[PDB]
Amino acid sequence: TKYRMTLGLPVQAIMNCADNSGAKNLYIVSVFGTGARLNRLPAASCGDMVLATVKKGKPDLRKKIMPAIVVRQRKAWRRKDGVYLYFEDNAGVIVNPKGEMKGSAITGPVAKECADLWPRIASNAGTVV
Amino acid sequence: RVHTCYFCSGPVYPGHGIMFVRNDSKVFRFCRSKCHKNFKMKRNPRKVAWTKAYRKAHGKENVPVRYDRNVIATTLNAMKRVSQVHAKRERLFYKKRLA
Amino acid sequence: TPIPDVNTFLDVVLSRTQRKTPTVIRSGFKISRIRGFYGRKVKFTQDTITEKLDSILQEFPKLNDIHPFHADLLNILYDRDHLKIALSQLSTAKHLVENVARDYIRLLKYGDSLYRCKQLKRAALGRMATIIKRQKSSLEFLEQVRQHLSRLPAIDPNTRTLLVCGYPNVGKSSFMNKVTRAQVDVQPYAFTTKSLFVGHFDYKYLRWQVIDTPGITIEMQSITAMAHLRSAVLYFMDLSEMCGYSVAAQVKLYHSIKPLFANKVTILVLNKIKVVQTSCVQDIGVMDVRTTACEALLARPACIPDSVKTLARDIEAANGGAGVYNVELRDKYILQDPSWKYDRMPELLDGKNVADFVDPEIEAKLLALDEEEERLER
Amino acid sequence: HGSLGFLPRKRASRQRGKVKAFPKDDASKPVHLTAFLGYKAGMTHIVRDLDRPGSKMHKREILEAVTVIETPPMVVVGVVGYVETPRGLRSLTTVWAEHLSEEVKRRFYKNWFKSKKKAFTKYAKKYAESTQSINRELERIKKYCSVVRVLAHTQIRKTPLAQKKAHLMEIQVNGGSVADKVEWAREHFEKTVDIKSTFEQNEMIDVIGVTRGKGNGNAGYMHRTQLNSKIYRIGAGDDAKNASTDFDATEKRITPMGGFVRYGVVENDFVMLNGATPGPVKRVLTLRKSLLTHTSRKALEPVSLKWIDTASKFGHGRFQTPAEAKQFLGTLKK
Amino acid sequence: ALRAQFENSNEIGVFSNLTNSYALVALGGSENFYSVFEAELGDVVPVVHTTIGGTRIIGRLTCGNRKGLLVPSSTTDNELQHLRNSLPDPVKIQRVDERLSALGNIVACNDYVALVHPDIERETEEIIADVLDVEVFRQTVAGNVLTGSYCALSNQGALVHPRTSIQEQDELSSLLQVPLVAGTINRGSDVIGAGLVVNDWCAFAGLDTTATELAVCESIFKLQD
RNA sequence: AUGUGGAACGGGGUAUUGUAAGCAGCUGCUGAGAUUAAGCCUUUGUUCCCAAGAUUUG
RNA sequence: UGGACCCACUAAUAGGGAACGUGAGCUGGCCUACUGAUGAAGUGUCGUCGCAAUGGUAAUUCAACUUAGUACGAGAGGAACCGUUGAUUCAGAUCAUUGGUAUUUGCGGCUGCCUGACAAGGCAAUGCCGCGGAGCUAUCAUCUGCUGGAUAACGGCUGAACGCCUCUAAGCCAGAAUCCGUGCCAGAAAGCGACGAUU
RNA sequence: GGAAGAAUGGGCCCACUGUCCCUAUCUACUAUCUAGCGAAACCACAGCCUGGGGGGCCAGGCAAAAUCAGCGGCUUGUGGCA
């Protein structure tokens, strides 16, 4: 499972894809497993599965409401050890509902929270920081 | 383990400060908010008077080992002796710097 | 989905309509408000009937769309022509109900008084009830069809299979029961296995579906299944004639059934002893026959330790169980002193990481440093 | 809106927390106390190993915010008797001690110095004259009464507070027969009861106090009682080795550098509480043993602190003690 | 070859690391996996239950051999001290501070020959060669930088991605001086390293691995006998 | 309403800014200077203040 | 529930009423309530410590690991009780850690004017900029959110009516997020008690 | 985060922003008190709620002064005809 962690990627936001599948920019549509809260747009963060559309990339891949896992976040969130973490940008991965990415590599460091939650993401990761 | 600040070059205790990682797999720890903003603005520590880097370079200043009871006991006393000896040299150095 | 009775379905539909839609309309309101209230109740009644009919149609499959083996078995064991007729009658009834509801809604759109609406509301319900009551035998046939379909197995002709057919009680079922974990009951009465029994089996890292067939409606079903199936024939002939059928009769039956056995591997099993002799009484040769039928159907050296050449869960469960058992890392340590292993260590003292600045050589270095410090002081 | 139960949102009528619910008595159990009242000074954060079975964070390192509450030992000054009646608990009589601490006398007087200090004067003499009368009253307590509470007061002198009035309150004495409680109360007259008597460095306590005031419905200054809130450590500041975590050694004192914000320097017995507590700093708080009996793993697990932070809470402090500070900083002109 | 799953996932390689002389297991998870490892090779080789950097991805992040074991520099010093206490004295553990944090996923090492990602630093390669006492070659597996995760290495055989060319597979096998088989495990999963772990005498695969894949792995690793 | 009393100041500790003015010869003074409780901690520091006025009370 | 009959989450996105729902909350084609704040008064007097009549109430739900790839199922698949950890909504607090906050007009930097000059200062309706403690606040930060009885459906037991039988008639047992208490808050300003002094 | 309700604005796109998520903080004034000055509308009599015939009637519930501040007022699930 995953503990409470700061949400900072609400719907109607543009978020960058960091794999080799050819996708470049990702548009958030909806968030999996969100409660029925009143007047609160669901958000996303590292290790969270959300519904997103590929804005730019390969034409066949885009125009599909597909699950996406965020791997990088600008917002500063606290890790349970007590240290606050923030990244230079927001990065995500192109993944099927089963939990498998079409791409075969990732770019740059990878949050361990995303890596530990999804074991095959750690398999594709080469730099876990 | 208390890490060393990237900008302030001081002791960083757990909890306080922030951790910043880079695309080149380089992670920088900022001791305080001012230090984090100092690294945010790319202020040179050698160009910052209140930084140990300038204080040093301006004339102003992996294999684990099996534990042993005797080694641990002597390590603590040696550290206290090392600090006492090191502090005296700085006082002489400051006196020489003042003179 | 389960098939309810005609009376029960009407009551459930009527009860659901009353429970969901409001039932308190005072006569002092507007005519449109009364018209809207009556129309909503009618529309809800139409929707509930439409949902039930659509669910029945979706649950009911298409005989043509089914596989050739499944469709033939369905037609033989369920009278697919009669089933198709009943489904069309239900579909026609659903269309007729929708037309009646649309006519009633249009009539309700020009409603005048509460009594006119009340009479119209009753009239629509009565017409629907009569249509539902008329379509009574269709529900009974559907319920019987659902029970037969549920009891029916999932045929997989694409995968490797072994069809056992021949004289009844010729030991083919016993061989099938031995080969596969599926156990079909056998009785002294002939044609005990009314329906085919399929048992999955593993051989040479391959999955084989041992499917039994009725001895020779059951015979017709067995013939139809063997007609369209990628499987090998397992014609078992009673060598000792203990199955009640003569050897010549079994041979004649096998020759007659050879048109269905064509384009497949044929095995001649000499029961109660490819021609394979299998002693049904002695239960000998069953494995050999199955194997034959399956075959017919088809510088970095390793430092292996001496211990390798020659539990934790139980321990945790006994003490406190999972989630209540804490495993101590001190025990799983190679420290020389057991007291040292079970004791803590100094992590960081006086602002310095002592654990990161303590080395085994410091034991002698400290004494040397102490001597050096004294010499420097002197 | 908020909870309907907490209505009305009126300011508390009591400055200090009142324990309305007390643990059920058990004569089989030995005589023991149930409630404590200390002073909230401030808070810090500590580093602690998280030995939670079955959790994903099992046998590893976690950071938890803690609160520091100074609890100087009280002085038992009297006992009261309570009788179970068809109208509830009724106060039968009350017996006190001889030499009341001078802070207690401040409680009875709104203008102590102007008053002639006449409180309990005739009671003191009548005790020294004839202890038989007191013995008769204690006979009444031990014979007729069913619930016994001892009169205890905070001893504020050794605290670093401008206030000089002792906070008086009652603590149930649960355990043993009625005569056993009275005898325990009698033998504890005029003496001090330490915090270590009731809490054992790992126990299930309920912190009570009046929340802080945000000003104007009313917003702030209501009575509150928090549940759970496990204890992390019951320090003994009288020992110079009070904080002194075994893992880190690093000789230190609980008092943060420069003193607690708006409180001062903590010197006496203090209790460490996880999370937060109702009420702002330098306010009297009340603790009590948890009413219910729950053996949940979050309430039964042992705690062995790894490292506590004694940095400068005033501003963005970064130094634990001057001993570790001086050698890091270059030798200044002073 | 033994088929088992960690928690509810068969990706044993991510959650555990198996060497020719020691075994790495996670902490705080399902105790059945530790019992299975202990029953399989616990009495033969040590099995350490610890987390590197407070994570259960130690198998997919740490790389090592029977001679030496390498861990990311981000691992806690307290974790390192516990590892040395658990591990035998002849086992060498060295911290690696390189641009690649996932040592296991980037480089797969055998008892004699090791293949690392081309982006590995020269100092890290020298440290790896010094620690593991094996030859380190900087190359790519199936055109993927993550050679240590998309391919599996063992003394008696090697497993590569099914998309690898025959000539490339032959070249890699000749370079590794061991037989190589290109395929997929865990019912078609292309992460052979993440989905399979094989030692010199024992092999541990996912519980969901296909029987044909298990039979192929046993023949390739010669683990049948 | 005479006290480990109160107060105003000041010292120390703690903190923010960034190394002053000036003396000078970027460097030294100087990781200085300034501010530091007005809702920070402490006071063997100097000073004065007070064993006070009115009102209602069986 | 979030977005223009729809398309996704979620456990679901139930139906209504307040007869011109709430158009004197909303838009388009004096006095009396309620909330809070004081308050004179019996009880001699003032004060401390309690009692608690009564009134209100608060937590909901998900997934996650064992218990499992066991029961079961030819297989394909695949339980549950318990135990334990997380998450969502809501509630009650708290400002160590992080962020926000600038009338500390605190420190630093920038521009202009003046004294014949340097210095020296001052000002620019808070000139401009950086940092900025303490405070305030953050589902942007953290902590915590029970346990006993009586019940409905329902399962039964004994047992007549009715020489059998019968959960019922006389009785009893079990059993629902239900009901009533426990805890939580208010504390009668015309409910009360113990206790200290009493010109 | 960036239209989910300041930028310089530029060429549906891009940029921008508390429109919104979700409000938080500050300053000033008003508000507030004190001193002084000081109205008018309006006024049968007044003023606690449930039910029955509204605030005055009947039967109930209750009921403690003086005040300050924010602020309300029959119908349902079953067609008809022969």
Side-chain angles (χ1 to χ4, degrees), chain A, chain B residues 10-11 14-15 17 45 49 53 57 59 64 73 78 87 99, chain C residues 2 4 22 28 36 39 61 68 71 86 93 101 111 123-124 126 129 153-154 157 166 168 171 182 188 190 199 214-215 225 227 232 244 248-249 259 262 285 293 296 299 301-302 305 312 317-318 320-323 338 346 351 355 360 364 368, chain D, chain E residues 1 4 13 23 26 28-29 39 42 46 53-54 59 64 68 72 88 90 102 104 108 114 118 129 142-143 148 152 157-158 162 179 182-183 188 193-195 203 205-206 211 215:
Chain A
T1 179
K2 171 244 296 182
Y3 314 86
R4 155 52 161 151
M5 96 80 65
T6 310
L7 279 162
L9 272 309
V11 281
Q12 291 91 17
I14 170 63
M15 191 305 298
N16 158 17
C17 157
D19 53 57
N20 54 27
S21 78
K24 304 298 295 297
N25 331 112
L26 208 30
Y27 194 10
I28 170 55
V29 164
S30 177
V31 176
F32 269 7
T34 308
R37 191 176 168 188
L38 186 31
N39 275 325
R40 168 78 151 178
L41 319 88
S45 34
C46 290
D48 311 336
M49 191 146 288
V50 290
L51 302 322
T53 79
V54 185
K55 191 168 186 64
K56 307 299 195 295
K58 200 60 66 69
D60 64 357
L61 287 175
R62 52 202 308 296
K63 314 309 293 176
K64 265 84 176 176
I65 310 297
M66 61 156 298
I69 303 169
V70 168
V71 317
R72 286 206 192 83
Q73 172 139 329
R74 273 287 298 183
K75 260 293 298 297
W77 50 263
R78 137 167 168 190
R79 154 161 91 181
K80 294 306 218 166
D81 67 352
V83 76
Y84 288 80
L85 273 179
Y86 81 114
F87 273 45
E88 283 91 327
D89 54 349
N90 313 40
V93 73
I94 301 319
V95 71
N96 52 39
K98 277 85 59 181
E100 199 270 347
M101 322 66 70
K102 266 68 68 180
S104 75
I106 214 59
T107 88
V110 170
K112 72 170 68 172
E113 302 80 358
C114 215
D116 192 83
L117 271 283
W118 300 137
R120 102 154 75 255
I121 286 284
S123 313
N124 204 11
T127 53
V128 186
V129 173
Chain D
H1 216 192
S3 180
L4 182 59
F6 290 73
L7 266 279
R9 292 254 167 83
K10 80 167 278 185
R11 314 201 324 209
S13 58
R14 315 204 39 71
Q15 155 63 24
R16 56 108 189 167
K18 160 185 184 189
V19 177
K20 313 185 182 174
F22 277 112
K24 41 172 298 293
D25 196 350
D26 293 301
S28 79
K29 299 287 290 185
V31 53
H32 74 82
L33 274 309
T34 37
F36 217 87
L37 80 176
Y39 290 88
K40 178 199 191 75
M43 30 186 185
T44 66
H45 57 258
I46 73 166
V47 152
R48 178 191 150 259
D49 59 325
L50 190 52
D51 288 350
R52 186 168 299 154
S55 192
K56 202 259 284 181
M57 262 314 316
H58 180 61
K59 293 288 283 186
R60 207 156 58 233
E61 164 47 45
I62 204 77
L63 178 87
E64 304 150 344
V66 302
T67 53
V68 182
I69 294 181
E70 187 176 301
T71 88
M74 302 76 87
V75 185
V76 157
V77 306
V79 83
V80 306
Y82 279 137
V83 47
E84 180 87 14
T85 69
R87 289 168 301 190
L89 268 300
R90 199 266 291 255
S91 58
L92 192 38
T93 191
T94 294
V95 188
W96 311 60
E98 284 317 276
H99 302 84
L100 53 95
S101 48
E102 201 45 59
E103 39 210 351
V104 159
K105 210 165 187 185
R106 280 181 182 263
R107 192 62 172 180
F108 298 122
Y109 285 104
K110 280 283 189 68
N111 253 318
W112 182 10
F113 283 90
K114 301 88 188 171
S115 81
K116 303 284 108 175
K117 297 93 182 172
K118 298 279 293 183
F120 288 76
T121 60
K122 261 84 77 177
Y123 171 78
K125 314 181 204 75
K126 81 189 290 291
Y127 184 112
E129 288 153 351
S130 74
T131 74
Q132 175 47 115
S133 64
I134 290 92
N135 291 318
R136 183 69 163 96
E137 315 293 3
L138 255 65
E139 188 259 331
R140 214 187 283 282
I141 302 267
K142 69 169 57 61
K143 191 178 176 182
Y144 293 179
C145 261
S146 53
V147 170
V148 176
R149 298 179 189 162
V150 301
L151 289 164
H153 82 89
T154 46
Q155 182 248 316
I156 212 160
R157 197 69 197 175
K158 40 183 49 53
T159 83
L161 275 308
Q163 203 168 359
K164 279 189 270 290
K165 292 176 76 69
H167 296 74
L168 191 56
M169 96 162 273
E170 295 69 22
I171 327 288
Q172 300 269 135
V173 311
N174 287 121
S177 174
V178 178
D180 306 327
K181 311 169 181 270
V182 177
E183 288 299 323
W184 189 96
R186 189 259 176 275
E187 67 197 1
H188 264 259
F189 276 156
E190 312 255 15
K191 266 155 72 178
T192 83
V193 177
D194 64 334
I195 170 64
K196 304 178 78 64
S197 77
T198 173
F199 303 161
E200 53 269 15
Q201 154 70 70
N202 269 319
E203 209 211 352
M204 260 336 294
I205 75 140
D206 319 329
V207 53
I208 308 195
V210 176
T211 54
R212 82 178 320 156
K214 309 289 185 180
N216 191 4
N218 185 91
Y221 203 60
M222 306 80 129
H223 193 290
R224 275 315 172 263
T225 289
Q226 260 196 21
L227 267 286
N228 207 347
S229 199
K230 170 172 176 127
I231 292 181
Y232 284 166
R233 172 176 293 194
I234 38 159
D238 313 336
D239 299 334
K241 182 214 68 172
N242 72 336
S244 304
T245 80
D246 48 355
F247 281 114
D248 271 23
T250 322
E251 289 280 22
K252 56 184 159 62
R253 185 63 69 95
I254 184 54
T255 291
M257 296 205 341
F260 266 113
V261 185
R262 294 166 51 227
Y263 181 85
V265 169
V266 168
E267 314 283 13
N268 327 68
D269 288 334
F270 66 98
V271 295
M272 197 94 56
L273 289 182
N274 33 72
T277 84
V281 305
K282 76 156 85 168
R283 191 201 287 283
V284 51
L285 283 202
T286 320
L287 323 169
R288 171 193 76 261
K289 303 197 188 300
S290 192
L291 225 65
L292 77 151
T293 309
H294 56 294
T295 41
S296 182
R297 273 63 171 171
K298 290 214 295 174
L300 218 36
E301 60 199 6
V303 162
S304 65
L305 297 193
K306 175 69 69 172
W307 163 75
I308 74 165
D309 178 273
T310 172
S312 169
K313 328 309 292 179
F314 196 108
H316 304 267
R318 50 187 303 158
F319 292 98
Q320 279 65 24
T321 187
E324 73 84 40
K326 285 185 296 297
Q327 73 293 30
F328 162 73
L329 54 95
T331 295
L332 212 179
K333 73 167 70 167
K334 60 176 193 179

